[PDB]
Amino acid sequence: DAFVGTWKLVSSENFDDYMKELGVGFATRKMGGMAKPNCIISVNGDVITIKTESTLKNTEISFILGQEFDEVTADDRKVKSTITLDGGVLVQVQKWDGKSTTIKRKREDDKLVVECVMKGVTCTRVYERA
Numbered sequence: 001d002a003f004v005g006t007w008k009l010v011s012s013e014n015f016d017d018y019m020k021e022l023g024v025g026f027a028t029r030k031m032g033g034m035a036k037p038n039c040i041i042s043v044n045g046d047v048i049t050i051k052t053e054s055t056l057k058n059t060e061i062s063f064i065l066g067q068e069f070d071e072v073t074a075d076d077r078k079v080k081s082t083i084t085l086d087g088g089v090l091v092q093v094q095k096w097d098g099k100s101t102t103i104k105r106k107r108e109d110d111k112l113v114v115e116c117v118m119k120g121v122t123c124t125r126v127y128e129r130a
């Protein structure tokens, strides 16, 4: 849809603080901090796939909106994830060990804007089409 495409990271604010708030260690934070991933979003029927590709780490999720799924995150958390579409925003919640984090993906002008929140930390990541 508006989301389908291949997207390259062009800016990131507060990602180190976000990773720290998630409990990510120095080594995994080091890998993530200067990474410039591509995010490849596709859809087949009910199933949306989001691939995140970078030199040192790749991830992929496939899901149906509103259906919880198990996910191993890029930082190796074992979480239960649910993704819904609310006002054109893909809203992902991840739940583990009594905690939660949200990842909200929206289209704004030429940008795919990704807001990641853990407790009082808000990170904003911007991708543009490859």
Ligand SMILES: CCCCCCCCCCCCCC(=O)O
Binding pocket: 019, 024, 028, 029, 031, 032, 033, 035, 037, 039, 052, 054, 057, 073, 074, 075, 103, 114, 116, 125
């Ligand atoms: C790209 C490599 C980063 C690996 C470090 C751990 C990151 C875990 C949280 C990732 C949140 C997703 C943000 C996004 O899709 O831009």
